[PDB]
C-alpha cells in the first residue's frame, strides 16, 4: 500500500536517530535516501492524478456523492500520511544537523542533500549572527559543561606547533604537558590537540 | 539544537554540583586580608565582597562554597565542617529514619553532594574519623533508596509528596518518575470522554 | 503526541482488523486489487492512521474497527495473571501507545485500568533493573527483551541517569 | 610588537570565531598593522575580513602561521583594493 | 509576660548584584524544567550583561596593571566568577533557544493571533525574536523545496491544524514536574490571600486539579509532583519553586 514506503522511510529515520543517540560521540548522519523520497513523491503524484480523474468523474457524476466522497477522502488521507512521514524524516535530519552545527561548526557533506547542505550553511550563519552582537560577551557555542576547575593540566595529544594566546603562547610539542587555566585551552581540547 | 538531549529534561550531576557551590559555608581563613587602620581587593559581583576583604587568620566566616574550594585547593583556607555532618547528627538521622519508615529524614536538601565534595577536597578538616562518616552517609543513602522504592510502589496520577527527599536523589529519579506519571495521566485522560 | 514524533508515526503505521459497511467501487486497491470494487461487510485490516478516520466518517461509518488480538480476552487475562512475565514486545512493538490510541478512539475504562496496572507493575521491575548498575545480566536481559519500545526508551533514560549519578559520585 | 596585539588577535580569531593562530602569523599581523600604520582601533574590522577570507578558503587552525596568514594577507589586500 | 517583642522590634526597626544572580539561577532552573517558555525577564539580563561587560573590562585593566600587593588570588576569583556567570547565562539562553525551536509553530500562531493575550516580543527577547523568525524562515524554505513543491496546495500547508494530527504542537500543560513550595516570597504569610493554614495549622496553597476534579494541599516548605498546568499560576507567582 502507499503507506508502506513511508513506513520504510520512518523506519530508516528511527534507525538513524538511534544511531546518533546510542553513539555518545557525534556521528555523521547516514546518506539521504533520495530513492525512497523520489518513489514516495511519484506515489503522491499518482494520487494527484487519481484525484483529478476522480473530479472528472464527479463531473460525470458516477455515484459521486458516495463513491467520489470516499475515494477523494482516502486519497487525501494517504497523501497526508506520506506527507507526515516525509516531514518527520526530514525534520529528524534537520535537528541532527542543527546538533552538529551547535556542537562543532559554531566552535560528510555528500551524505547531505543539497537542500540540507544549504540549510546547514544558513543555520551556521544564523548561529554566528547570534553570538555576534548583543550577548557576545558569553560564547553561546561555548561548552555547556560547568567550569568547575579553574586550572587544568593538559598534555598535547597531537603536536601542532606553537599557538597564540591573549597574553601568552603555547608550544604544542608531542608528549609535552601544560598547566594552564581550562578556559584558555578549552577550544584546543575540543579541537582534539590537547588531552585531559 | 542548542541543548543536548541528555540535558533536555533534567540536570546532570555537574549542574547539581554548581548550584550547590552557589551556597555559602563556614571556613577558617589562613590569611588576613583585613587591612589594619594603621592593595589587591576581591570586589566580587555575584556574591559578597565585604567579608573577603576582611579575612583574618583563624576567624570563622562565610563564603560561597566555590570560593572556599578555590582557596582550599591552596593551603590558605580551611573548610569548616557543617554541623549536620557529624557522627552524632548522622546517627540521630539514622535513628529517626528507622523510627519513621514512611517519612524521610530532614537532611539538608544538598546533603549528598555537599558530603561528597567535602570528602573529596576536605578530608583534613573533618574532625571525626572520615571513614566512619563515609560509612554512615552510605547507610543513609541505602535507607533512603529503600524508602524511595517503597514510595514508588504507590505511584499514582493524582500527585506525589517526596517531602524531605534530597536534591541529588530528586535529580536521580526525575526522568523515570516524570515519564511514568505522564504515561499514567495520558491513559487515564484517554479513558475520560 | 507530536506530529513529527517518530514513534507516533510508526505506531500509526500499524494496521488493525476492520470491516466495511458499504460496497464502494474503485477501492479494491485496498485489497491490492484496484479493479475490484469494495463490498459491504468486507473484512479488511487497515492502517491505524487510515482506519481511524474511516471509522470516524460514514449514520453508518464506512468501516468498522474489529477487536484486535492485542486487546483479546486472552491478552487481558495474561496481563492480570502476571504483568512482568508477559512479553509485551512479542505481542507488539508499540503496545502501550497503541492501547492509549484505542482508548482515545473508544472510552474503554476497564482497558484503561488494566493498562495502568500493567504499566505500574512492569515499571517497578524496570526501575529495579535500571538501578542495578553493574559496578548485562541474563535476568535483566530477558526483562529488556520483553520490554516494549517505550519501556525500552524509559529504561535507557533511567539507566543513563543512574550511571551519571554513580560516575559523578564515586569518581571525581 | 606582535605580542601587544596578541590579546586582540586571540580574541579576534580564536575567541572571535575560535580560529587557532600561530605566533609567527601574529608577527605578520604586526607587519600588516605597520602597513596600516594609522590608528589600529579600526583595523579590527580589517582583521575580521581577513578571518572571513581564511574561513572561506584556508580553513585551518593556527591560522596565524605567517605563511598561510600571508596568503590571506595578499588575498584580503587584493579584495581590499577591488572594493 | 508582657509581649514587648513588638516593642523591641519597632525599637530595632530604627538591586543587589548577588540578588540578581540568585534570581537568574532560579529563572534558569525554571526554564530548564518548565515545559513552556517563560517570560524573558528582560531587565535582569540587561543589568547582568552590563555588569559582566564592565567586570570583564576592569579585570582586563587589572591584567594590564599586572603587566605594568600583587597577589593574584582575587584575580583568580574574578576569572572563575565570570566563567561561572557566563556559563549560567549561556545555559539559560541555549535552553530557551532549543525550546523555541521545539514549539516554533505554536509561537508563530500565537504571534499571528491578534487576540493573543501575550505578544511574542513580550516572551521572546530581541535576539530570540530574530532567531526564531529567521530559523523558521530557513526551515520553511528547506521543507518547501524538499517536499511541498511536489505536494498539492491543500497539503502544502505547514501550520495545518485540520489534518488528523495537528502539525502545530504545544508544550504539555499537563506534564508532571517536580516542585517545591517556597511559600510566600516575603516573610509575611497572612498577607497573601491564597495562603491559608491547614491541618496542624500548616499553610498551603490549595489548588483544584480539574482533570481529576480533586484538591491538593501543598504545604509550605515541601516537595510535590504536579501537572505543570495546575502550578502555572503559583510558579508564576513564585510561591513555588520548579524543582
UniProtKB/Swiss-Prot annotation, chain B:
GO terms for biological process: DNA-templated DNA replication; double-strand break repair via break-induced replication. Keywords: DNA replication, Nucleus. It is found in: Nucleus. It comes from the Eukaryota. The keyword Lipid metabolism does not apply. GO terms for cellular component: CMG complex; DNA replication preinitiation complex; GINS complex; nuclear replication fork; nucleus. Pfam families: PSF2_N, Sld5. Gene3D superfamilies: 1.20.58.1020, 3.40.5.50. The keyword Nucleus applies. PANTHER family: DNA REPLICATION COMPLEX GINS PROTEIN PSF2. Component of the GINS complex which is a heterotetramer of SLD5, PSF1, PSF2 and PSF3. Interacts with PSF1 and SLD5. Belongs to the GINS2/PSF2 family. Functions as part of the GINS complex which plays an essential role in the initiation of DNA replication by binding to DNA replication origins and facilitating the assembly of the DNA replication machinery. This is DNA replication complex GINS protein PSF2.
Swiss-Prot record, chain C:
InterPro entries: GINS_A, GINS_bundle-like_dom_sf, GINS_Psf3, GINS_Psf3_sf, PSF3_N. It holds the Pfam family Sld5. One of its GO terms (cellular component) is nuclear replication fork. Its main location: nucleus. Disulfide bonds: none annotated. One of its GO terms (biological process) is double-strand break repair via break-induced replication. Keywords: DNA replication, Nucleus. It is found in: Nucleus. Present with 2205 molecules/cell in log phase SD medium. Belongs to the GINS3/PSF3 family. Component of the GINS complex which is a heterotetramer of SLD5, PSF1, PSF2 and PSF3. Functions as part of the GINS complex which plays an essential role in the initiation of DNA replication by binding to DNA replication origins and facilitating the assembly of the DNA replication machinery. This is DNA replication complex GINS protein PSF3. The lineage of its organism: Eukaryota, Fungi, Dikarya, Ascomycota, Saccharomycotina. The gene is PSF3.
UniProtKB/Swiss-Prot annotation, chain D:
It is found in: Cytoplasm; Nucleus. Phosphorylated in a cell cycle dependent manner during late G1 phase. Phosphorylation may facilitate the interaction with POL2 or the activity of DNA polymerase II. Phosphorylation is independent of DNA replication but dependent upon CDC28 in vivo. As accessory component of the DNA polymerase epsilon complex participates in chromosomal DNA replication. It is required during synthesis of the leading and lagging DNA strands at the replication fork and binds at/or near replication origins and moves along DNA with the replication fork. It has 3'-5' proofreading exonuclease activity that correct errors arising during DNA replication. It is also involved in DNA synthesis during DNA repair. Belongs to the DNA polymerase epsilon subunit B family. Present with 3110 +/- 251 molecules/cell in log phase SD medium. In eukaryotes there are five DNA polymerases: alpha, beta, gamma, delta, and epsilon which are responsible for different reactions of DNA synthesis. DNA polymerase epsilon is a heterotetramer consisting of POL2, DPB2, DPB3 and DPB4. This is DNA polymerase epsilon subunit B. The lineage of its organism: Eukaryota, Fungi, Dikarya, Ascomycota, Saccharomycotina. The chain holds residues 13 to 95 of 689 of the full protein.
From Swiss-Prot, chain E:
The keyword Ligase does not apply. InterPro entries: GINS_A, GINS_bundle-like_dom_sf, GINS_Sld5, SLD5_C, Sld5_GINS_A. Component of the GINS complex which is a heterotetramer composed of SLD5, PSF1, PSF2 and PSF3. Interacts with PSF2. It is found in: Nucleus. CDD domains: GINS_A_Sld5, GINS_B_Sld5. This is DNA replication complex GINS protein SLD5. Belongs to the GINS4/SLD5 family.
Amino acid at each position: 500500500m502507499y503507506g508502506d514506503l513511508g513506513n520504510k522511510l520512518v523506519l530508516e529515520a528511527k534507525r538513524t536517530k538511534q544511531l546518533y543517540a546510542r553513539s555518545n560521540q557525534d556521528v555523521n548522519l547516514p546518506m539521504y535516501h533520495e530513492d525512497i523520497i523520489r518513489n514516495i513523491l511519484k506515489e503522491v503524484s499518482n494520487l494527484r492524478k487519481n484525484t483529478e480523474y476522480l473530479k472528472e468523474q464527479q463531473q460525470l457524476g458516477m455515484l459521486d456523492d458516495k463513491v467520489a466522497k470516499c475515494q477523494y477522502f482516502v486519497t487525501l488521507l494517504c497523501m497526508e500520511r506520506n506527507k507526515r512521514c516525509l516531514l518527520a524524516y526530514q525534520r529528524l535530519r534537520t535537528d541532527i544537523l542543527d546538533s552538529m552545527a551547535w556542537n562543532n561548526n559554531g566552535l560528510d557533506t555528500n551524505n547531505l542533500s543539497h537542500q540540507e547542505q544549504e540549510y546547514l550553511k544558513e543555520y551556521c550563519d544564523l548561529i554566528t549572527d547570534l553570538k555576534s552582537g548583543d550577548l557576545v560577551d558569553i560564547d553561546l557555542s561555548g561548552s555547556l559543561v560547568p567550569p568547575s576547575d579553574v586550572f587544568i593540566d593538559v598534555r598535547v595529544l597531537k603536536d601542532a606547533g606553537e599557538i597564540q594566546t591573549e597574553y601568552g603562547v603555547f608550544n604544542l610539542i608531542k608528549d609535552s604537558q601544560f598547566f594552564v587555566r581550562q578556559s584558555d585551552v578549552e577550544r584546543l581540547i575540543q579541537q582534539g590537540y590537547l588531552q585531559k | 539544537m542548542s541543548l543536548p538531549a541528555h540535558l533536555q529534561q533534567t540536570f546532570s550531576p555537574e549542574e547539581i554540583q554548581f548550584i550547590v557551590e552557589n551556597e555559602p559555608i563556614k571556613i577558617f581563613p589562613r590569611i588576613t586580608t583585613r587591612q589594619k587602620i594603621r592593595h589587591t581587593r576581591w570586589q566580587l559581583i555575584t556574591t559578597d565582597d565585604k567579608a573577603l576583604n576582611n579575612m583574618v587568620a583563624m576567624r570563622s566566616t562565610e563564603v560561597v562554597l566555590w570560593i572556599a574550594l578555590l582557596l582550599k585547593q591552596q593551603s590558605k583556607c580551611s573548610i569548616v565542617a557543617p554541623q549536620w555532618l557529624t557522627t552524632k547528627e548522622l546517627d540521630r538521622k539514622i535513628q529517626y529514619e528507622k523510627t519513621h519508615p514512611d517519612r524521610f529524614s530532614e537532611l539538608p536538601w544538598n546533603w549528598l553532594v555537599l558530603a561528597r565534595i567535602l570528602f573529596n577536597k576536605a578530608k583534613d578538616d573533618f574532625h571525626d574519623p572520615i571513614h566512619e562518616l563515609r560509612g554512615k552517609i552510605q547507610d543513609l543513602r541505602e535507607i533512603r533508596q529503600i524508602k524511595v522504592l517503597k514510595g514508588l510502589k504507590y505511584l499514582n496520577e493524582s500527585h506525589l509528596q517526596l517531602d524531605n527527599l534530597s536534591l541529588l536523589e530528586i535529580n536521580e529519579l526525575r526522568p523515570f518518575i516524570t515519564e511514568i506519571m505522564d504515561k499514567l495521566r495520558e491513559i487515564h485522560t484517554a479513558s475520560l470522554t | 503526541m507530536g506530529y513529527y514524533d517518530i514513534d507516533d508515526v510508526l505506531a500509526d503505521g500499524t494496521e488493525f482488523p476492520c470491516k466495511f459497511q458499504y460496497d464502494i467501487p474503485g477501492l479494491g486497491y485496498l485489497e491490492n486489487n484496484p479493479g475490484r470494487p469494495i463490498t459491504k461487510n468486507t473484512k479488511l485490516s487497515l492502517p491505524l492512521w487510515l482506519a481511524r478516520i474511516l471509522a470516524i466518517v460514514g449514520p453508518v461509518p464506512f468501516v468498522e474497527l474489529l477487536p484486535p488480538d492485542m486487546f483479546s480476552t486472552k491478552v487481558m487475562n495474561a496481563i492480570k495473571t502476571d504483568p512482568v512475565a508477559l512479553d509485551l514486545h512479542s505481542i507488539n512493538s508499540h503496545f502501550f501507545s497503541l492501547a492509549i490510541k484505542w482508548i482515545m478512539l473508544f472510552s474503554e475504562k476497564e482497558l484503561a485500568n488494566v493498562v495502568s496496572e500493567l504499566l505500574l507493575q512492569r515499571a517497578q521491575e524496570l526501575n529495579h533493573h535500571a538501578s542495578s548498575l553493574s559496578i548485562t545480566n541474563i535476568a535483566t536481559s530477558t526483562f529488556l527483551l520483553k520490554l516494549e519500545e517505550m519501556e525500552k526508551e524509559i529504561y535507557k533514560k533511567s539507566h543513563e541517569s543512574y550511571k551519571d549519578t554513580k560516575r559523578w559520585m564515586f569518581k571525581k | 610588537q606582535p605580542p601587544l596585539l596578541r590579546p586582540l588577535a586571540y580574541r579576534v580569531l580564536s575567541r572571535k570565531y575560535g580560529l587557532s593562530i600561530k605566533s609567527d602569523g601574529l608577527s605578520a599581523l604586526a607587519e600588516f598593522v605597520g602597513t596600516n600604520i594609522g590608528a589600529n582601533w579600526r583595523q579590527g574590522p580589517a582583521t575580521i575580513k581577513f578571518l572571513e577570507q581564511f574561513a572561506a578558503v584556508w580553513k585551518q587552525q593556527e591560522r596565524g602561521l605567517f605563511i598561510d596568514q600571508s596568503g590571506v594577507k595578499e588575498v584580503i589586500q587584493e579584495m581590499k583594493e577591488r572594493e | 509576660d508582657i509581649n514587648i517583642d513588638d516593642i523591641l522590634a519597632e525599637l530595632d526597626k530604627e538591586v543587589s548584584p548577588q540578588q540578581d544572580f540568585s534570581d537568574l539561577m532560579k529563572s534558569w532552573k525554571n526554564e530548564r524544567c518548565s515545559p513552556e517558555l517563560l517570560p524573558y525577564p528582560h531587565q535582569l539580563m540587561k543589568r547582568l550583561l552590563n555588569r559582566i561587560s564592565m567586570q570583564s573590562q576592569l579585570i582586563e585593566n587589572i591584567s594590564m596593571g599586572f603587566l605594568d600587593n600583587e597577589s593574584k588570588l582575587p584575580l583568580l576569583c574574578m576569572e572563575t566568577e565570570l566563567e561561572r556567570l557566563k556559563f549560567v547565562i549561556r545555559s539559560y539562553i541555549r535552553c530557551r533557544l532549543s525550546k523555541i525551536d521545539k514549539f516554533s509553530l505554536y509561537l508563530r500562531q500565537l504571534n499571528e493571533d491578534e487576540n493573543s493575550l501575550i505578544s511574542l516580543t513580550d516572551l521572546l527577547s530581541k535576539d530570540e525574536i530574530k532567531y526564531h523568525d529567521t530559523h523558521s524562515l530557513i526551515w520553511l524554505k528547506l521543507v518547501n523545496d524538499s517536499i511541498l513543491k511536489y505536494m498539492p496546495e491543500e497539503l502544502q500547508a505547514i501550520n495545518d491544524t485540520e489534518g488528523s494530527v495537528n502539525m502545530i504542537d504545544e508544550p504539555d500543560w499537563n506534564k508532571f514536574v517536580f516542585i517545591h513550595v517556597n511559600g510566600p516570597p516575603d516573610g509575611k504569610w497572612n498577607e497573601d490571600p491564597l495562603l491559608q493554614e491547614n491541618e496542624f495549622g500548616k499553610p498551603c496553597y490549595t489548588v483544584t486539579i480539574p482533570d481529576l476534579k480533586e484538591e491538593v494541599e501543598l504545604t509550605i516548605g515541601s516537595i510535590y509532583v504536579m501537572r505543570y498546568e495546575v502550578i502555572r499560576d503559583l510558579l508564576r507567582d513564585d510561591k513555588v519553586a520548579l524543582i
